[PDB]
């Protein structure tokens, strides 16, 4: 039966009570919060919060407290949870958050912020932690934020969304947390740091009926729109109902984020997902994001996905699949591509992205990197290692001169002959092969004539893939085999790139101290020759 | 002479005592731990631990407490050390740890966990901190864990091993610690985060007699077996008796770890060491680890070492040596290679690894990267910078088509001529040079005949290094010099890759509007010619 | 009116008072610090510090305390700030710091360390936090360190410098801080970790009159001299009066630092700035630093700047500009280069640096990477993406064989003909084009004669850029066009690299079963020919 104590009393500077008044528990007088975990404590905690702000004192939650209205942590207040079991259990209604953090340097340490966790309910809708637009350098660290769900999509925030943690602040730190909710973490602010968190909503073990649809209670690990200058590092992101780490693109202008050294696996959509769903605009785009040094694997609809984004980089990641893909995604096969580039939803091109030094492992032999028609300005570095996957795939040969494939791409085309007069028709056995390495294309062209119709004058081979309307700095071609040409002794064929139409190669021949451009006149219906060389294009 | 206080008494909610009961010091009643640092306090601390778990209270160690049995931190309990001098001094016997952390979110902040620190003793054996197999998201942060040693190898854990911190948990955080013990940190769990630690056992200043042997009390900074999905970042790892950061491979299946932005230097074995000692199996392998952005230097038996591992990457590291190597390792020289690939101990190949964008500095001119016979599927990127080291070394020329050397490799071979009939013998001055860049090999072949024996018919040059049984997409060859051939005026030599045996080049000649394959008939005993060109192989 | 309490009294082990004595507030007796924020509290805080060190207790600052002399945090003491508004307001005079941290494991958590913040004053000079040369594994975490300024440069530290935080210790952690001062953070120690800080002195909104000059009160975000083995990661560095992150080079030997995953923008000098201002010496150099995965943009005098440094790497950064550059730097245009290499201030060469996998965006089309004359041993990887900037710029063609440009460089030269006897003069329409890719140079040379003067004998083309005195492993050249040569039927021109002078190409011709080196004799005043090929140089 020890002395009475209250944060409302005035004590002398030398007293036990003054010393104790530096730390406030909501169970202390005059707040007197319940300790049974079931009685509402919102009034007691709100009073303790306001007192600590007014008097400049530390607030420590020493139990798991039931609440029914938002706790607003403002004015630089820090909430410290006494133990990992302390914190709040939220019965806050739809349209409000359990905890709202705002102001300069406000934050929350430790403990638990727990929603109802009824993801099968078609009526419960809740939101966990909000850092609002006036949060500056706020934080939540070491906290289990779980159980915020909302079946069916909202039309507005007032419906309740199912966010675990939603950051709209500047410089927010989210670190050492466990976030598990319909949208585990949502990013809509600037300069945040999302570090060493465990992020999942465990869609794979949820029991929610498949296929996935917009009615699901299980979406992304990290969903980002209007996110700028975040660093997302050292997180363990897995088994989410949509993508592990997503940036849009869907009413969002998301730029300059750095996604590094995370593990992202077993998600039902993509692993790391950057793309445009809404049409590109000054207020909707995904630009200049860095994806580096991550391990991404067994994500159903591709491990690293770029759709219509620009100036992004994918460097030094290990992206892979194994046969557990066929188990966890049984019945619902997806793209199964290690690194895929695509158009935006409304056809926008991937522009200016940089893919280098990644290791892609795909035992199905699916292409480790895919490139779609329309992509421009991208660089596919030769430090990428696809030896344990399929080779890089391009959807059309014109990509080889509108992008730079240091990782080499090989293909074929059907050549034709363009006589100055008349015509020459080639047998179908005629064949052209190209390989692009950087801004060099190597060629082998086999020309087997099947018929002629009064050909005469100059002769060109056409059409070199990718070269239409391009120019070149240098090129080099030989003809190393021929048969049934009308050539005098000592006359040999020569070949040189057509500098007017640089997807054509001019074929001509020697005449002592000069050359002659009459090769079409030397062709017969049974002529054959083979051309080899390269073009350094601009 | 102030009021009595005890965590065993019941106080009113409004009392001083209830407020104080939220924080437990083991010196408080009823625990009454000694404060002299020499009296055993195990019973008092065990009681305080059990009380804090039962009552949901915070445990603070306010002295350095002597203990003789394991403290078990379970059930989400956090141990907070009051000051950097608080914590435990361990007299726990061999076969047990000083501290065992288990359960969900249990952990330890600050202070000291101190072993006997008698590394010269042939009888003292101790272990420091264990995160056991039931640890989930546990942690130790800000702690000096030192002095756990055990001279001579254990046969089982019950002997006592000499671990400083041993993590077998899921999601364990080890951060801001100083770990110094026979094995400073040992990793055998999943999804741990080993961040911004100081790791060393100071072998160089130990005075333990050299050479190193299995009886040493000084092994690795980080030793890992069955380690999955760790991030090891921002650590300062140095002067260890074996390797700085090691993954096996020796009864361990270690995969998907990310080792980034560490400094690793002056270790007696390797800096960052990934390899197989036990034979490769479904339960013993080292796969898909990422080594990125580290600074590794003056490690005696090589800075970055890969032995029989697969799908690993080494990207963007700076690996170097200076003349202090000759000082600290005087008398005991080692490999002194910046980045070395080797076979596993039982001959297993390095498969599918990716080495790019590293800067290697070796003033001895030792090769900055070494590649052994048998390696396959590896990619050596051209962004590596070995200008301040020796050039990349390959142990046999066949490696150039079973791996992809964007970082170019040059070599030589001795050509032969393969006449269709008869024989042609070349002088020893005949020479072939190749350079592989990616999937292109450039060649120069000088053919000087010394004798002939009735050669006639077709002619091939052989054997192109790496090309045996390979195919090609395109190739291009000329003969730009010859002497003492039997060629009529206007007949010139031609050369084209043999498409049946693509390590041979067919040599033939012109005959007006066709070509003729009778070159062996045009050779004399004094013939010479020189061939130049390239092959784009598949 | 509760019981008296004092840290000077002796209490029983079972007492309230003994429990309370583990935590010291400076307002407690016998220290009795003022709480008004204006009365000097230095004596009270110094006494509390000494008491906590002597008795092994925790020190908590529970108000913002005014101080007029340095607080020395030594002996492993930690200062904990009760709230984000607690800490110290410094009226310490010029030549001393507000707080000095030294010893093993000493540090400061939270709160504020506030200077006078009068950057317009020509007389106020102050310094914030010092980690001195005897600091080992000390830290400051979670602290706002602002307002330390000093207009005009010091001549010595005793003048007062304007440091926010100055680290000369070993292993110092600076994390989660806001640092804003004349020099926000200064690094002069070893193995520090500067993590997830906000760093700025807001030069752009200061109102200090422009142009910037050495009299400014606004210098770098991070200024480093004699800095070794730091990791600088996850910081938000912007709007500084000089550079964001600087290493010298100016009385400093700075090596082995790792600068990763930071955002650096809007600085008035450079973003990430490594360079030599003082002449290179054994005690002044910048070596082996790693710059990886940063986003650097709109820094006035270039985003990433290397001046006379060696063995550094720039890998995987996104470096860019937009039209806001023209707004914030209106009136004061700067270099506006994404990645620039330069000589040191005294002409020292950039040696051995590695630039790969960066994405450069410059809508002005300025070169994304610039290389100066004299640079050697550098590697410019082909994974760099400059498609959205100007192409890499080299200041002289000789750079192509003293560095390795995997990112290809194209240029031109004016050829000459070197007859064995006599002379040949070319028309000005004669032209040579080269492209260097790695250690391969491709060439196209057009030779149009305008006059001859008795030429006879052998013939060489000269001079190939970069090749003077170089050797080669292989090379391949053809002549694919000619006109007005004196060639009999069946005689064709041949070309081969001059192996004595490998910046010359020998031009000669066929003569049946041999070749003849008399090409100068076959030239006329109207001759033309075109040469194509490549050299693989060593």
Coordinates of N, CA and C in Angstrom, one line a residue, chain B residues 66-215:
Chain B
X66 N 27.2 -11.8 -13.0 CA 27.9 -13.1 -13.2 C 26.8 -14.2 -13.3
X67 N 26.9 -15.1 -14.3 CA 25.9 -16.2 -14.4 C 26.7 -17.5 -14.7
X68 N 26.0 -18.6 -14.3 CA 26.6 -19.9 -14.5 C 25.6 -20.9 -15.2
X69 N 24.5 -20.4 -15.6 CA 23.6 -21.2 -16.5 C 22.9 -20.3 -17.5
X70 N 22.5 -20.9 -18.6 CA 21.9 -20.2 -19.7 C 20.7 -19.4 -19.2
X71 N 20.7 -18.1 -19.6 CA 19.5 -17.3 -19.5 C 18.6 -17.5 -20.8
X72 N 17.4 -17.9 -20.6 CA 16.5 -18.2 -21.8 C 15.5 -17.0 -21.9
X73 N 15.7 -16.2 -23.0 CA 14.9 -15.1 -23.3 C 13.8 -15.5 -24.3
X74 N 12.6 -15.7 -23.8 CA 11.6 -16.3 -24.6 C 10.3 -15.5 -24.5
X75 N 9.3 -15.9 -25.3 CA 7.9 -15.3 -25.1 C 7.9 -13.8 -25.5
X76 N 8.8 -13.3 -26.3 CA 8.7 -11.9 -26.7 C 9.4 -11.0 -25.7
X77 N 10.0 -11.5 -24.7 CA 10.7 -10.7 -23.7 C 11.9 -10.0 -24.4
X78 N 12.0 -8.7 -24.1 CA 13.3 -8.0 -24.4 C 14.1 -7.7 -23.2
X79 N 15.4 -8.0 -23.2 CA 16.3 -7.6 -22.2 C 17.0 -6.3 -22.6
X80 N 16.9 -5.3 -21.8 CA 17.5 -4.0 -22.0 C 18.6 -3.8 -21.1
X81 N 19.8 -3.5 -21.6 CA 20.9 -3.2 -20.7 C 20.9 -1.7 -20.4
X82 N 21.0 -1.4 -19.1 CA 20.9 0.0 -18.6 C 21.9 0.9 -19.3
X83 N 23.2 0.3 -19.3 CA 24.3 1.1 -19.8 C 25.2 0.1 -20.6
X84 N 26.2 0.7 -21.3 CA 27.0 -0.1 -22.1 C 27.9 -1.1 -21.2
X85 N 28.0 -0.8 -19.9 CA 28.7 -1.7 -19.1 C 27.9 -2.8 -18.4
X86 N 26.6 -2.8 -18.6 CA 25.7 -3.7 -18.0 C 25.6 -5.0 -18.9
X87 N 25.1 -6.1 -18.3 CA 24.9 -7.3 -19.1 C 25.3 -8.5 -18.3
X88 N 25.9 -9.5 -18.9 CA 26.3 -10.7 -18.2 C 27.7 -11.1 -18.4
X89 N 28.4 -11.6 -17.4 CA 29.7 -12.3 -17.5 C 29.4 -13.8 -17.3
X90 N 29.8 -14.5 -18.3 CA 29.4 -15.9 -18.4 C 30.4 -16.9 -17.8
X91 N 30.0 -17.6 -16.8 CA 30.8 -18.8 -16.3 C 30.0 -20.1 -16.6
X92 N 29.2 -20.1 -17.7 CA 28.4 -21.2 -18.1 C 29.3 -22.3 -18.6
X93 N 29.1 -23.6 -18.3 CA 30.0 -24.6 -18.7 C 29.8 -25.0 -20.2
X94 N 30.8 -25.7 -20.7 CA 30.9 -26.2 -22.1 C 29.6 -27.0 -22.4
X95 N 29.0 -26.7 -23.6 CA 27.8 -27.4 -24.1 C 26.6 -26.6 -23.9
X96 N 26.7 -25.4 -23.2 CA 25.5 -24.5 -23.1 C 26.0 -23.1 -23.5
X97 N 25.0 -22.3 -23.9 CA 25.2 -20.9 -24.2 C 25.0 -20.0 -23.0
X98 N 25.6 -18.8 -23.0 CA 25.3 -17.8 -22.0 C 23.9 -17.4 -22.1
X99 N 23.4 -17.1 -23.3 CA 22.0 -16.6 -23.5 C 21.4 -17.3 -24.7
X100 N 20.2 -17.7 -24.5 CA 19.4 -18.4 -25.5 C 18.1 -17.6 -25.8
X101 N 17.9 -17.2 -27.0 CA 16.8 -16.3 -27.4 C 15.9 -17.1 -28.3
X102 N 14.6 -17.2 -28.0 CA 13.7 -18.0 -28.7 C 12.3 -17.4 -28.6
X103 N 11.4 -17.9 -29.4 CA 10.0 -17.3 -29.5 C 9.9 -16.2 -30.5
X104 N 8.8 -15.5 -30.4 CA 8.5 -14.5 -31.4 C 8.8 -13.1 -30.8
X105 N 9.7 -12.4 -31.5 CA 10.0 -11.0 -31.1 C 10.8 -10.9 -29.8
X106 N 11.5 -11.9 -29.3 CA 12.4 -11.8 -28.1 C 13.7 -11.2 -28.5
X107 N 14.4 -10.6 -27.6 CA 15.6 -10.0 -28.0 C 16.4 -9.3 -26.8
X108 N 17.5 -8.7 -27.2 CA 18.5 -8.2 -26.3 C 19.0 -6.9 -26.8
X109 N 19.0 -5.8 -26.0 CA 19.5 -4.5 -26.4 C 20.7 -4.1 -25.5
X110 N 21.8 -3.8 -26.2 CA 22.9 -3.1 -25.5 C 23.8 -3.9 -24.7
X111 N 24.6 -3.2 -23.9 CA 25.5 -3.9 -22.9 C 26.5 -4.9 -23.5
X112 N 26.8 -5.9 -22.7 CA 27.9 -6.8 -22.8 C 27.4 -8.3 -22.5
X113 N 27.9 -9.2 -23.3 CA 27.8 -10.6 -23.0 C 29.2 -11.2 -23.1
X114 N 29.8 -11.5 -22.0 CA 31.3 -11.7 -21.9 C 31.6 -13.1 -21.5
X115 N 32.4 -13.8 -22.3 CA 33.0 -15.1 -21.9 C 34.3 -15.0 -21.2
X116 N 34.8 -16.1 -20.8 CA 36.1 -16.1 -20.0 C 37.3 -15.5 -20.8
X117 N 37.2 -15.5 -22.1 CA 38.3 -14.9 -23.0 C 39.7 -15.5 -22.7
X118 N 39.8 -16.8 -22.6 CA 41.1 -17.5 -22.4 C 41.4 -18.3 -23.6
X119 N 41.7 -17.7 -24.8 CA 41.9 -18.5 -26.0 C 43.1 -19.3 -26.0
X120 N 44.0 -19.1 -25.0 CA 45.2 -20.0 -24.9 C 44.9 -21.3 -24.1
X121 N 43.7 -21.3 -23.4 CA 43.4 -22.5 -22.6 C 43.0 -23.7 -23.4
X122 N 43.6 -24.8 -23.1 CA 43.3 -26.0 -23.8 C 42.1 -26.7 -23.2
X123 N 41.5 -26.2 -22.2 CA 40.3 -26.8 -21.5 C 39.1 -25.9 -21.5
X124 N 39.2 -24.6 -21.5 CA 37.9 -23.8 -21.5 C 37.2 -23.9 -22.8
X125 N 35.9 -24.2 -22.8 CA 35.1 -24.2 -24.0 C 33.7 -23.6 -23.6
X126 N 33.3 -22.6 -24.4 CA 32.1 -21.8 -24.1 C 31.4 -21.3 -25.4
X127 N 30.2 -20.9 -25.3 CA 29.4 -20.4 -26.4 C 28.6 -19.2 -25.9
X128 N 28.4 -18.2 -26.8 CA 27.8 -17.0 -26.3 C 26.3 -16.9 -26.4
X129 N 25.8 -16.5 -27.6 CA 24.4 -16.2 -27.8 C 23.9 -17.2 -28.8
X130 N 22.7 -17.9 -28.5 CA 22.1 -18.7 -29.5 C 20.7 -18.2 -29.8
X131 N 20.3 -18.1 -31.1 CA 19.0 -17.9 -31.5 C 18.5 -19.3 -32.0
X132 N 17.6 -20.0 -31.2 CA 17.4 -21.4 -31.6 C 16.4 -21.5 -32.7
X133 N 16.0 -22.7 -33.0 CA 15.2 -23.0 -34.2 C 13.8 -22.5 -34.1
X134 N 13.4 -22.1 -32.9 CA 12.1 -21.5 -32.6 C 12.1 -20.0 -32.5
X135 N 13.2 -19.4 -32.8 CA 13.3 -17.9 -32.8 C 12.6 -17.4 -34.1
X136 N 11.7 -16.4 -33.9 CA 11.1 -15.8 -35.1 C 11.2 -14.3 -34.8
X137 N 11.8 -13.6 -35.7 CA 12.0 -12.1 -35.7 C 12.6 -11.7 -34.3
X138 N 13.5 -12.4 -33.8 CA 14.3 -12.1 -32.6 C 15.4 -11.2 -33.0
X139 N 16.1 -10.6 -32.0 CA 17.2 -9.7 -32.3 C 18.2 -9.6 -31.2
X140 N 19.4 -9.2 -31.5 CA 20.4 -8.6 -30.6 C 21.0 -7.4 -31.2
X141 N 21.0 -6.3 -30.5 CA 21.4 -5.0 -31.1 C 22.2 -4.2 -30.1
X142 N 23.4 -3.7 -30.5 CA 24.1 -2.8 -29.7 C 25.0 -3.5 -28.6
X143 N 25.3 -4.7 -28.8 CA 25.9 -5.6 -27.7 C 27.3 -6.0 -28.1
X144 N 28.2 -6.0 -27.1 CA 29.5 -6.5 -27.2 C 29.5 -8.0 -26.7
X145 N 29.7 -8.9 -27.7 CA 29.6 -10.3 -27.4 C 31.1 -10.8 -27.7
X146 N 31.8 -11.1 -26.6 CA 33.2 -11.4 -26.8 C 33.7 -12.5 -25.9
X147 N 34.8 -13.1 -26.2 CA 35.5 -14.0 -25.3 C 35.0 -15.4 -25.2
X148 N 34.3 -15.9 -26.2 CA 33.9 -17.3 -26.3 C 34.8 -18.1 -27.2
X149 N 35.5 -19.1 -26.6 CA 36.6 -19.8 -27.3 C 36.5 -21.2 -26.9
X150 N 37.3 -22.1 -27.6 CA 37.2 -23.5 -27.4 C 38.3 -24.1 -28.2
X151 N 39.5 -24.4 -27.6 CA 40.7 -24.8 -28.4 C 40.5 -26.2 -28.9
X152 N 40.7 -26.5 -30.2 CA 40.4 -27.8 -30.7 C 39.0 -27.9 -31.2
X153 N 38.8 -28.6 -32.3 CA 37.5 -28.7 -32.8 C 36.6 -29.6 -32.0
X154 N 35.3 -29.2 -31.9 CA 34.3 -30.0 -31.3 C 34.0 -31.2 -32.2
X155 N 33.4 -32.3 -31.6 CA 32.8 -33.4 -32.3 C 31.3 -33.2 -32.4
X156 N 30.7 -32.5 -31.4 CA 29.3 -32.1 -31.4 C 29.1 -30.8 -30.6
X157 N 27.9 -30.2 -30.8 CA 27.6 -29.0 -30.1 C 27.8 -29.2 -28.5
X158 N 27.5 -30.4 -28.0 CA 27.6 -30.6 -26.6 C 29.0 -30.4 -26.0
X159 N 30.0 -30.4 -26.9 CA 31.4 -30.2 -26.5 C 31.6 -28.8 -26.1
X160 N 30.8 -27.9 -26.7 CA 31.1 -26.4 -26.7 C 31.9 -26.1 -27.9
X161 N 31.5 -25.0 -28.6 CA 32.0 -24.8 -30.0 C 32.9 -23.5 -30.0
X162 N 32.6 -22.5 -29.3 CA 33.3 -21.2 -29.4 C 32.6 -20.2 -30.2
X163 N 31.2 -20.4 -30.4 CA 30.4 -19.4 -31.1 C 30.3 -18.1 -30.2
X164 N 30.4 -17.0 -30.9 CA 30.0 -15.7 -30.3 C 28.5 -15.6 -30.4
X165 N 27.9 -15.5 -31.6 CA 26.5 -15.5 -31.8 C 26.2 -16.5 -32.8
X166 N 25.3 -17.5 -32.5 CA 24.9 -18.5 -33.5 C 23.4 -18.3 -33.7
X167 N 23.0 -18.1 -35.0 CA 21.6 -17.8 -35.3 C 21.1 -19.0 -36.1
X168 N 20.1 -19.8 -35.5 CA 19.4 -20.8 -36.2 C 17.9 -20.3 -36.4
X169 N 17.6 -19.1 -36.2 CA 16.2 -18.6 -36.2 C 15.7 -18.2 -37.6
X170 N 14.5 -17.6 -37.6 CA 13.9 -17.0 -38.8 C 13.8 -15.5 -38.6
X171 N 14.4 -14.7 -39.5 CA 14.3 -13.3 -39.4 C 15.1 -12.6 -38.3
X172 N 16.2 -13.3 -37.8 CA 16.9 -12.7 -36.7 C 17.7 -11.4 -37.2
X173 N 17.6 -10.4 -36.4 CA 18.4 -9.2 -36.6 C 19.6 -9.2 -35.6
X174 N 20.8 -9.1 -36.2 CA 22.1 -8.9 -35.4 C 22.6 -7.6 -35.9
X175 N 22.6 -6.6 -35.1 CA 23.0 -5.2 -35.6 C 23.7 -4.4 -34.6
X176 N 24.7 -3.6 -35.0 CA 25.4 -2.7 -34.2 C 26.1 -3.4 -33.0
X177 N 26.5 -4.7 -33.3 CA 27.2 -5.5 -32.2 C 28.7 -5.5 -32.5
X178 N 29.5 -5.9 -31.5 CA 30.9 -6.2 -31.6 C 31.0 -7.7 -31.3
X179 N 31.3 -8.5 -32.3 CA 31.4 -10.0 -32.1 C 32.8 -10.5 -32.3
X180 N 33.4 -11.1 -31.3 CA 34.8 -11.5 -31.3 C 34.8 -12.8 -30.5
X181 N 35.0 -13.9 -31.2 CA 35.1 -15.2 -30.6 C 35.7 -16.2 -31.6
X182 N 35.8 -17.5 -31.2 CA 36.5 -18.4 -32.1 C 35.8 -18.4 -33.5
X183 N 34.5 -18.5 -33.5 CA 33.6 -18.3 -34.7 C 32.8 -17.1 -34.3
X184 N 33.1 -15.9 -34.8 CA 32.4 -14.7 -34.2 C 30.9 -14.7 -34.4
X185 N 30.4 -15.0 -35.6 CA 29.0 -15.1 -35.9 C 28.8 -16.3 -36.7
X186 N 27.8 -17.1 -36.4 CA 27.5 -18.3 -37.2 C 26.0 -18.3 -37.6
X187 N 25.8 -18.6 -38.9 CA 24.5 -18.4 -39.5 C 24.0 -19.8 -40.0
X188 N 22.8 -20.2 -39.5 CA 22.3 -21.5 -39.9 C 20.8 -21.4 -40.0
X189 N 20.2 -20.1 -40.1 CA 18.8 -19.9 -40.2 C 18.4 -19.3 -41.5
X190 N 17.2 -18.6 -41.5 CA 16.6 -18.1 -42.7 C 16.2 -16.7 -42.5
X191 N 16.5 -15.8 -43.4 CA 15.9 -14.4 -43.5 C 16.5 -13.5 -42.4
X192 N 17.7 -13.8 -42.0 CA 18.3 -12.9 -41.0 C 18.9 -11.7 -41.6
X193 N 19.2 -10.7 -40.7 CA 19.8 -9.4 -41.2 C 21.0 -9.2 -40.3
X194 N 22.2 -9.2 -40.8 CA 23.4 -9.0 -40.1 C 24.0 -7.7 -40.5
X195 N 23.7 -6.6 -39.8 CA 23.9 -5.2 -40.2 C 24.8 -4.4 -39.3
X196 N 25.8 -3.7 -39.9 CA 26.6 -2.7 -39.3 C 27.2 -3.2 -38.0
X197 N 27.8 -4.4 -38.0 CA 28.5 -5.0 -36.9 C 30.0 -4.9 -37.1
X198 N 30.7 -4.9 -36.0 CA 32.2 -5.0 -36.0 C 32.5 -6.5 -35.7
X199 N 33.2 -7.2 -36.6 CA 33.4 -8.6 -36.5 C 34.9 -8.9 -36.6
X200 N 35.5 -9.4 -35.6 CA 36.9 -9.8 -35.7 C 37.2 -10.7 -34.5
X201 N 38.2 -11.7 -34.7 CA 38.8 -12.3 -33.5 C 40.3 -11.9 -33.4
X202 N 40.8 -11.0 -34.2 CA 42.1 -10.4 -34.0 C 43.2 -11.5 -34.0
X203 N 43.2 -12.4 -35.0 CA 44.2 -13.4 -35.0 C 45.6 -12.8 -35.2
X204 N 45.7 -11.7 -35.9 CA 47.0 -11.1 -36.2 C 47.7 -10.7 -34.9
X205 N 47.0 -10.2 -33.9 CA 47.6 -9.8 -32.7 C 47.4 -10.7 -31.5
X206 N 47.0 -12.0 -31.8 CA 46.6 -13.0 -30.8 C 47.9 -13.5 -30.1
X207 N 49.0 -13.7 -30.8 CA 50.1 -14.4 -30.3 C 50.0 -15.9 -30.4
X208 N 48.9 -16.4 -30.9 CA 48.8 -17.9 -31.1 C 49.9 -18.3 -32.2
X209 N 50.6 -19.3 -31.9 CA 51.7 -19.8 -32.7 C 51.2 -20.2 -34.1
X210 N 51.9 -19.8 -35.1 CA 51.7 -20.1 -36.5 C 52.5 -21.3 -36.9
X211 N 52.2 -22.0 -38.0 CA 51.1 -21.8 -39.0 C 49.7 -22.1 -38.3
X212 N 48.7 -21.5 -39.0 CA 47.3 -21.9 -38.6 C 47.1 -23.3 -38.9
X213 N 46.2 -23.9 -38.0 CA 45.8 -25.3 -38.2 C 44.5 -25.5 -37.5
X214 N 43.8 -26.7 -37.8 CA 42.5 -27.0 -37.2 C 42.5 -26.9 -35.7
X215 N 43.6 -26.8 -35.0 CA 43.6 -26.7 -33.5 C 43.5 -25.2 -33.1

